[PDB]
Amino acid sequence: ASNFTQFVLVDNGGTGDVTVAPSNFANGVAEWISSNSRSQAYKVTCSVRQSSAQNRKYTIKVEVPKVATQTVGGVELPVAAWRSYLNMELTIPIFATNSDCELIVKAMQGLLKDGNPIPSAIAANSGIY
């Protein structure tokens, strides 16, 4: 293997895709960034450690630019009005086999499949109702 490669983060179907590429590995934290200024980039980081004697935790973070009315390459302040931050922590018991970890991945991607309630609440700027 060799996991640390470029991948498509936003698939707008071929044209307008956002690819994110390896950009830092200081401290064994893999970072991927898109081709933009660091203030407007899509950024992804991932690391894993044994959190307790019984568990490992993957910590995954994503930053996504507010794009409507963006000025590309512009200085946009305040930073917080222009960025969304995702923070995932996955705690997996040391007993989990690879098959177990496959299922955890499937649960994670089921949660976010189109049409399911959580992605469609987020995208519609809504809560659950």
Under rule CB under 8 A, which residues in 32-91 are in contact with its own copies?
32-33, 35-39, 41-42, 44, 46-50, 52-56, 58, 60, 62, 64, 66-91
Pick 14 or 127: Cβ nearer its own copies: 127
Amino acid letter, residue 121: A
For residue 78, the minimal CB distance to its own copies (Å) is 6
Q: Which of residues 89-118 bind its own copies (CB under 8 A)?
A: 89-118
Binding flag, residue 14, its own copies (CB under 8 A): no
Give burial (CB, 10 Å; 0-12/13-18/19+) of 22. middle
Residue 45 to residue 58: CA distance in whole angstroms: 10
CB of 16 to its own copies, least distance (A): 10
Q: How far is the CB of 103 from its own copies (least distance, A)?
A: 6
Rounded-to-integer distance, Cα 43 and Cα 85, Å: 10
Size of the site for its own copies (CB under 8 A): 112
Please tell me the distance from the alpha carbon of residue 86 to that of residue 89, in angstroms, as a whole number: 10
Minimum CB–partner distance for residue 115 and its own copies (Å)? 8
* Helix (H) / strand (E) containing 48: strand 43-50
